[PDB]
């Protein structure tokens, strides 16, 4: 998160920190959010050979009683996900067991808010602590320069006149508008110039229910 502020610890208790394993590289990291006690929603580009979810985190370098490190048994990447266009950048992770509900862990033109442990700058490292930024929902033409952006599939997020933005490592986290999840951090420019592209959750809600009901 570029241009945001540190959250009050555990103020966003649905937030999931994902450590993703690949066979041919070191670990990578994403966000996500707990939608059921045993399901986390994130972006498809966060898929890997294996994933661990950490719930209840604030300072992700300092283990604490709020932490629940949970095994992911199966990854449900959208079957039409496209690794070029990044259409359909949405994935469900089924957790091995249902999480514990605690104070720190629970399920989940206008201004919206996005939170994550991503980089605080193009050349800056990932944040130790959960950061949040408020971003403006843009008219789709503000994202035209992303040639494979589609207004029906995706939100266009963040005023190009501000430097505020999600960035690397914030992938898969929720954009909330008036307290409801509406987007998932998907992609943007390498220079972090807004706006960025978020998956439009509403479009995927039939697919989400299908997965939940079958698992
Ligand atoms: C399908 O078309 C695309 C076009 C762009 C990329 N691409 C490319 C980058 C690069 O080239 O380094 C890059 O850093 N990022 C990260 C990035 C940048 C800006 C904002 C964000 C976000 F807001 F999403 F968090 C993110 C994740 C990136 O998404 C991925 C596919
Ligand atoms: C997050 O927690 C870590 C503890 O692991 C903090 O890291 C310490 O930070 C100070 C600088 O403020 C260093 O001098 C210490 O060496 C660090 N300790 C360790 C174990 O690495 C970090 O400051 C915390 N971040 C917050 C709360 O913003
Ligand atoms: C992904 O999108 C590209 C460009 O529109 C298309 O040519 C390609 O076949 C797609 N890949 C799959 C199999 O989804
Ligand atoms: Zn916050
Ligand atoms: Zn704590």
Query: CA 45 → CA 105, 115, 168, distances in Å?
Result: 25, 18, 12
Lookup: tokens for 51: 């994933």
Q: Go through the domains of the chain in sequence order and give each one's CATH number.
A: 15-105+204-214 (2.40.10.10), 108-202 (2.40.10.10)
**Exposed/middle/buried for 46, CB within 10 Å: 0-12, 13-18, 19+?**
buried
Q: Mark the residues whose beta carbon lies below 5 A from ion ligand 5.
A: 9, 64, 66
**Exposed/middle/buried for 95, CB within 10 Å: 0-12, 13-18, 19+?**
buried
- 61 C-alpha to ligand 2 centroid (Å): 8
CB 10 within 8 A of CB 66: yes
Breaks in the chain (C–N beyond 2.5 Å) sit after 108
**Nearest-CA neighbor of 16 among 1, 32, 36, 37?**
32
Per-residue burial over 185-202, b if 16 or more Cβ lie within 10 Å, else e, is bbbbeeebebbbbbbbbe
Query: CA 63 → CA 6, 15, 81, 188, 191, distances in Å?
Result: 18, 16, 34, 31, 32
Give the DSSP letter of residue 97: S
Lookup: tokens for 183: 């987007």
Phi, psi (rounded to 5 degrees) for 87? -60, 145
Q: Mark the residues whose beta carbon lies below 5 A from ion ligand 4.
A: 7, 132
**Nearest-CA neighbor of 72 among 38, 98, 96?**
96
d(CA 60, CA 213): 32
Helix-strand-coil split of the chain, %, nearest 5: 10, 40, 50
Residue nearest to atom 3 of ligand 1 (CA): 187
Token pair 């514990």 in the structure block, residue: 100
Task: Among the bound ligands, name the one nearest to the CA of residue 9.
Answer: 5
CB 172 within 8 A of CB 32: yes
Binding site membership of 59 for ligand 2 (Cβ less than 6 Å): yes
Please provide the DSSP assignment of 27-54 as one string.
Answer: -EEEEEEEEETTEEEE-GGG--SEEEEE
Give the largest CA-CA distance in the chain. Answer: 46
Please provide the DSSP assignment of 169-180 as one string.
Answer: T-TTPEEEETTE
User: Does 45 participate in catalysis according to the annotation?
Assistant: yes
In terms of DSSP bridges, do strands 154-157 and 174-177 run parallel, antiparallel, or are they unpaired? Answer: unpaired
d(CA 147, CA 213): 35
Q: How was this structure determined?
A: X-ray
Atom of ligand 3 at shortest distance to CA of 81? 14
Binding site membership of 205 for ligand 3 (Cβ less than 6 Å): no
Residue nearest to atom 23 of ligand 1 (CA): 166
Q: Which long-range contacts (CB under 8 A, 24 or more apart) does 205-210 make?
A: 207/78, 207/90, 208/35, 208/41, 208/90, 208/92
Resolution in A: 2.0
- 214 C-alpha to ligand 4 centroid (Å): 33
Binding site membership of 85 for ligand 3 (Cβ less than 6 Å): yes
User: Does 89 participate in catalysis according to the annotation?
Assistant: yes
Q: Which long-range contacts (CB under 8 A, 24 or more apart) does 151-154 make?
A: 152/200, 152/203, 153/87, 153/88, 153/199, 153/200, 153/203, 154/186, 154/197, 154/198, 154/199, 154/200
CB 104 within 8 A of CB 13: yes
Residue nearest to atom 24 of ligand 1 (CA): 187
Binding site membership of 128 for ligand 2 (Cβ less than 6 Å): yes
């Amino acid at each position: 998160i570029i241009g945001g502020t540190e959250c009050k610890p555990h103020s966003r208790p649905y937030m999931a920190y994902l450590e993703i394993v690949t066979s041919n590289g070191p670990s990578k990291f994403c966000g996500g959010f707990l939608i059921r006690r045993n399901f986390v929603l994130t972006a498809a580009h966060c898929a890997g050979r294996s994933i661990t979810v950490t719930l209840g985190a604030h300072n992700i370098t300092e283990e604490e009683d709020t932490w629940q490190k949970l095994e992911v048994i199966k990854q449900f990447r959208h079957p039409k996900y496209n690794t070029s266009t990044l259409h359909h950048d949405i994935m469900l992770l089924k957790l091995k067991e249902k999480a514990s509900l605690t104070l720190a862990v629970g399920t989940l033109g206008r201004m919206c808010r996005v939170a994550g442990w991503g980089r605080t700058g193009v050349l800056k490292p990932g944040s130790d602590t959960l950061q949040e930024v408020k971003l403006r929902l843009m008219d789709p033409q503000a994202c035209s320069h992303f040639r494979d952006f589609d207004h029906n599939l995706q939100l266009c997020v963040g005023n190009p006149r501000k430097t505020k933005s999600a960035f690397k490592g914030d992938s898969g986290g929720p954009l909330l508008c008036a307290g409801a999840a509406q987007g998932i951090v998907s992609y943007g420019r390498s220079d972090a110039k807004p706006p960025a592209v978020f998956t439009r959750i509403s479009h995927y809600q039939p697919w989400i229910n299908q997965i939940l009901q079958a698992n």
